[PDB]
């Protein structure tokens, strides 16, 4: 008995809304106005259907300032920290999608850019989905993406994904063919897979797509989106203070995914091609 899974891109309409409303420690928890703004974003995502243009948003001066603060600091770090594929694609986004300190890019523009480059596209998502449903988007080269901005009281830290994390952390690598293929194959492996297998694929995703390191020309570089949008952990990850291990799915999938602190350990992939090969070998063992 295989569980239901999407068979075509529009089938994500039936799981994208199955969202499993701020946590007590959220910076905007007591902010009625921010709460109202978040309801606005959540409704845009809930009402979205595949085929729609993604609704364009007029961001407030406050939201744009928060983005600018994060953008400015992270861009100082990227040349010495980010992998070559990230650095190659970031300027294309400045040119074609309006990445600037004083402008938050629109998801529809970024989606059109990705569609041309690698066939990836964006779907706005209200909030957290099951790992099964989130990974199933990747099978159709769909990235479920938050559209809201973090609270302005703390521009540097966010307990959840926001659109700064999506646009600065995830998008430049989805524009890279080798990474897009790697990501899609995680989604494909997940379709109709056992609960057990889905969880293991989710953890492998976490320690590559979200917090991965890679080796390039003998150096350690960052490709994980969660690192690329966190000023403090981006620096920490390439400091001598961090614990590092080679990416190895059978080992990596045993590691706990930390959400409110720095990771205990980071995994180093040799290349996106090699990570992809290692996942192919791994998925055979859990089908
Ligand atoms: C299968 C992987 C786990 N996983 C899941 O099971 N379901 C998801 O919906 C999911 C997810 N992962 C991410 C995307 C994501 N990026 C993150 C970056 C972070 C983070 C959490 C993140 N979740 O904390 C540290 O930095 N999402 C999208 C998401 C959207 C809105 C709120 C939370 C999460
Ligand atoms: Fe993420």
UniProtKB/Swiss-Prot annotation:
Cofactor: Fe(2+)
Binding residue positions for Fe cation: 165, 170, 210
Amino acids binding L-tryptophan: 128, 150, 158, 229, 259
Keyword field contains Iron: yes
GO cellular component, one term: neuron projection
Catalysis: reaction(s): (6R)-L-erythro-5,6,7,8-tetrahydrobiopterin + L-tryptophan + O2 = 5-hydroxy-L-tryptophan + (4aS,6R)-4a-hydroxy-L-erythro-5,6,7,8-tetrahydrobiopterin
The record's account of how the chain is modified after translation: Ubiquitinated, leading to its degradation by the proteasome. Ubiquitinated is triggered by phosphorylation. Phosphorylated; triggering degradation by the proteasome.
GO BP field: aromatic amino acid metabolic process; bone remodeling; mammary gland alveolus development; platelet degranulation; positive regulation of fat cell differentiation; regulation of hemostasis; serotonin biosynthetic process
One Gene Ontology MF term: tryptophan 5-monooxygenase activity
Keywords for the protein's UniProt record, in alphabetical order: Iron, Metal-binding, Monooxygenase, Oxidoreductase, Phosphoprotein, Serotonin biosynthesis, Ubl conjugation
Catalytic activity, EC: 1.14.16.4
Pathway(s) this gene product operates in, as recorded in its UniProt entry: Aromatic compound metabolism; serotonin biosynthesis; serotonin from L-tryptophan: step 1/2
Complex and partners: Homotetramer. Interacts with DNAJC12.
Family recorded in the similarity comment: Belongs to the biopterin-dependent aromatic amino acid hydroxylase family.
Function: Oxidizes L-tryptophan to 5-hydroxy-l-tryptophan in the rate-determining step of serotonin biosynthesis.
UniProt name for this protein: Tryptophan 5-hydroxylase 1
Organism: Homo sapiens
Encoding gene per record: TPH1
């Amino acid at each position: 008995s295989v569980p239901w899974f999407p068979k075509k891109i529009s089938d994500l309409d039936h799981c994208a809304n199955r969202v499993l409303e701020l946590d007590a420690d959220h910076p905007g928890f007591k902010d009625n106005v921010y709460r109202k703004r978040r309801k606005y974003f959540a409704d845009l995502a809930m009402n979205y259907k595949h085929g729609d243009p993604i609704p364009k948003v007029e961001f407030t001066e406050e939201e744009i300032k928060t983005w600018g603060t994060v953008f400015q600091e992270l861009n100082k770090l990227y040349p010495t920290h980010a992998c070559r594929e990230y650095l190659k694609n970031l300027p294309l986004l400045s040119k074609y999608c309006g990445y600037r300190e004083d402008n938050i890019p629109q998801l529809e523009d970024v989606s059109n850019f990705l569609k041309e480059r690698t066939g990836f596209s964006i779907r706005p998502v209200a909030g957290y989905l099951s790992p099964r449903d989130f990974l199933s988007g990747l099978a159709f080269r769909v990235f479920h993406c938050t559209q809201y901005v973090r609270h302005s009281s703390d521009p540097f830290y966010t307990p959840e994904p926001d659109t700064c994390h999506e646009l600065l952390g995830h998008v430049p690598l989805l524009a890279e063919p080798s990474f897009a293929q790697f990501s899609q194959e995680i989604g494909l492996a997940s379709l109709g897979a056992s609960e057990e297998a889905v969880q293991k694929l989710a953890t492998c995703y976490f320690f590559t797509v979200e917090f991965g390191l890679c080796k390039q020309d003998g150096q350690l570089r960052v490709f994980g989106a969660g690192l690329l949008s966190s000023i403090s952990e981006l620096k920490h990850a390439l400091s001598g203070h961090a614990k590092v291990k080679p990416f190895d799915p059978k080992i990596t999938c045993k590691q706990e995914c930390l959400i409110t602190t720095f990771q205990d350990v980071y995994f180093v992939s040799e290349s996106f091609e090699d990570a992809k090969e290692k996942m192919r070998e791994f998925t055979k063992t859990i089908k």
